[PDB]
Design a binder for this molecule. Structure first.
Ligand SMILES: Cc1cc2nc3c(=O)[nH]c(=O)nc-3n(C[C@H](O)[C@H](O)[C@H](O)COP(=O)(O)OP(=O)(O)OC[C@H]3O[C@@H](n4cnc5c(N)ncnc54)[C@H](O)[C@@H]3O)c2cc1C
Ligand SMILES: Cc1cc2nc3c(=O)[nH]c(=O)nc-3n(C[C@H](O)[C@H](O)[C@H](O)COP(=O)(O)OP(=O)(O)OC[C@H]3O[C@@H](n4cnc5c(N)ncnc54)[C@H](O)[C@@H]3O)c2cc1C
Ligand code: NA
Ligand code: NA
Ligand code: NA
Ligand code: NA
Lengths: 386, 386
């Protein structure tokens, strides 16, 4: 047949499934993708004026402790030795971040040793016991105290969720957000880096296989009757929206979206670091990305006197908005449970498998989507394709 | 014969020459080493109480942009992804270091953009033109201004050299010691890391070859008549002290030494970072090393409640002291020129080649010693061993 497997969506989940079926089982795979390019939100591109690699659907940082996933992605791209670091702007000062000996010295005004900092945090967080916290605000205060909470967490979180932290779940903070050393690596994972030739090249390489057919600018729901009629027994891996698949029969799942404001500025360096969080309420955006600093190894290809920056604004995802993060209200958890039932029925009657961020209503980092796709491939698709 | 080449000293220079002759020319090499272990000052060892890898002859950080040298050393050890970072203690605050947007924010009290920082440094350094600087103090001030100089350079340099900076050469600072971004990598080189299994294992591996014989606890000047009599036409590569070789016939070359004070403390973490500079005069030591933080990947082998730290004191190298850094007074440059003549005569009449830090009166980093030995091997020893 012309294809043995249909994959809807070319994010990391779709690409992984498609590539494994193609290379490991020698199956013909047809990828159907609604957008004009491969890669889902991980897709990046050159900003036209400067040539700098940028993202329109969120900056993407790769990191994992899963060696299987690390070895896998390295088949398709090399990675730079980029290590993500973030600074936090508060009351006109850029603080070392996350909270650690550096921020503590800057904020409290003198050097604390690791043991002195531990004792400081004990004193600061004395007021509320974590066991008694009834919301995010109280949870934070119970761990690090009011001064730190009020400076670095309160307004930032308010902007992030468009909600008073008093009305957010205590379960949103699960561990002490403080380090007792000067380590300011943002991530804690074994492996980390950025694709040497950019995300677009990496993701294109995943789908570059003699057994893979790619149809861009194609909506599954427009073409599905025709495609399946060509080969009815070919399974489908669906990574589009779960609720949309079932015509919103149980209602609309709730998502957060982001608005990105991009500017080309007439300086070669706007903030001297890839990401500056803006922790204060007076700034409407949560942070500014300056994209050239993600790839310092490219500095002589970057313009000397121009730079691209991006500001980020969060709000509720309405119709037409890209859905980014599941909101997960109890109502959302309710209809999700109902959609899972429908989906499972569809897998049994129609050989349609549901996966990925949109397909399962679950935020997934790149390595987690890949891991999830490797699992589905191993545990479901190998059998289904025999 | 029992050997074809004698190498005096087993630092990186000696090891490199020995290994190349052994593996590339199939020559039998005899290494003669005065100390009880291989590796010269790069040698490291486990501190007995804690097991932590420490140095008795200075902490050794490996870094290079020389790809030939990088590829070479990786034949003998793997390297961790360690990236050196230093903090600077001044008036009770740990500053981000080297001077950059982080230190500038901490010191001047609010955030400066890259362009604002450039303008700040222009204003601060206006007083003295670099072209007019007559000593180190004036040179520093001409580049960064008095407040920064007085806080971070003056006393530190005084301790380092035991000299008023007014009496040090303007040529000691050759470039702007300020970055206009938040990059606090201490080194600027392409490749960097620490030996995964420690320096002792790496350096031992270099000399581990069927063609290499090692005699430790052996002073060249005690055994040389006997050894050369066994095979008169075998050349010698000498990496011991240049002036000592010629019985100080032209006087004693001047060196700086370091005293290291090591302590085991009853805490698992003393300062939360490998190195803290102490920039103020009130502290007699220049900096404190906390050795466990050089190898965080070993944290579950390190003790939970103990740590080894080391304080560093600089002074003139007297008899019995390990000579570390050439002082290079004009008098020193004088007799060095005379020793170079003697050495060159000795190479012609006696087939004794002079190399390495002690052998040439020149401080050499590990990668520079290796590069220098590779050159000597390529350009001198291949011919001499035919
Ligand atoms: C703003 C943002 C920032 C992120 N930052 C990071 C990060 O820093 N590090 C990290 O590891 N991960 C990050 N991620 C997650 C990352 O994008 C993952 O790769 C993604 O979540 C993987 O899941 P996926 O492949 O299912 O999703 P997607 O990337 O959403 O891919 C789904 C694809 O299905 C297509 N599709 C949808 N409907 C149809 C249809 N009807 N017909 C045909 N095609 C369709 C979509 O166009 C899309 O291309 C971020 C995600 C977002 C949204
Ligand atoms: C305090 C200090 C800190 C340093 N830190 C770094 C760093 O962070 N990063 C870096 O890249 N480099 C560093 N170095 C330099 C590093 O040690 C180099 O490897 C070294 O300078 C290389 O030169 P070498 O092999 O000639 O010297 P050496 O290491 O001095 O080796 C010379 C050897 O010759 C032996 N010897 C001397 N006389 C005799 C004799 N009569 N008979 C037999 N044997 C003899 C000595 O015992 C010694 O083992 C540091 C050096 C010092 C001193
Ligand atoms: Na991201
Ligand atoms: Na508490
Ligand atoms: Na050193
Ligand atoms: Na000046």
């Amino acid at each position: 047949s012309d294809f043995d497997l249909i994959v809807v969506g070319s994010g990391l989940f779709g690409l992984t499934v498609a590539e494994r079926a193609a290379s490991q089982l020698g199956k013909k795979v047809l990828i159907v993708e609604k957008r004009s390019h491969l890669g889902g939100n991980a897709y990046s591109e050159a900003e036209p004026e400067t040539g700098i690699e940028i993202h329109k659907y969120g900056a993407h940082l790769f990191h994992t402790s899963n060696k299987r996933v690390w070895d896998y992605v390295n088949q398709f791209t090399a990675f730079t030795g980029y290590q993500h670091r973030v600074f936090a702007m508060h009351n006109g000062t850029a603080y070392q971040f996350p909270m650690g000996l550096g921020l503590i010295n800057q904020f409290f005004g003198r050097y604390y040793t690791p043991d002195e900092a531990r004792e400081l945090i004990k004193e600061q967080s004395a007021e509320i016991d974590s066991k008694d916290a009834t919301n995010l605000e109280e949870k934070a205060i119970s761990l690090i105290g009011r001064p730190l909470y009020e400076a670095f967490i309160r307004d930032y979180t308010a902007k992030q969720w468009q909600t008073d932290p008093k009305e957010l779940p205590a379960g949103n903070i699960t561990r002490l957000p403080v380090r007792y050393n000067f380590d300011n690596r943002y991530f804690n994972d074994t492996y980390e880096g950025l694709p040497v030739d950019g995300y677009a090249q990496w993701l294109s390489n995943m789908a570059d296989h003699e057994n893979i057919e790619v149809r861009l600018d194609t909506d599954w729901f427009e073409v599905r009757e025709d495609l399946r009629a060509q080969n009815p027994e070919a399974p489908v891996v669906y990574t589009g929206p779960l609720d949309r698949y079932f015509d919103y029969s149980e209602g609309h799942l709730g998502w957060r979206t982001l608005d990105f404001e991009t500017e080309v500025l007439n300086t070669g360096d706007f903030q001297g670091t890839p990401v500056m969080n803006y922790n204060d309420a007076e700034f409407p955006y949560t942070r500014i990305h300056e994209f050239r600093h993600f790839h310092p190894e490219r500095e002589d290809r970057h313009p000397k006197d121009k730079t691209v920056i991006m500001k980020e604004y969060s709000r509720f995802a309405e119709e037409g908005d890209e859905p980014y993060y599941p909101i997960n209200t109890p109502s959302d958890r309710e209809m999700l449970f109902k959609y899972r039932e429908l989906a499972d029925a569809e897998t049994e009657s129609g050989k349609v498998y549901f996966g990925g961020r949109l397909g399962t209503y679950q935020y997934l980092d790149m390595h987690m989507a890949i891991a999830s796709a490797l699992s589905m491939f191993d545990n479901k698709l190998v059998d289904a394709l025999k």
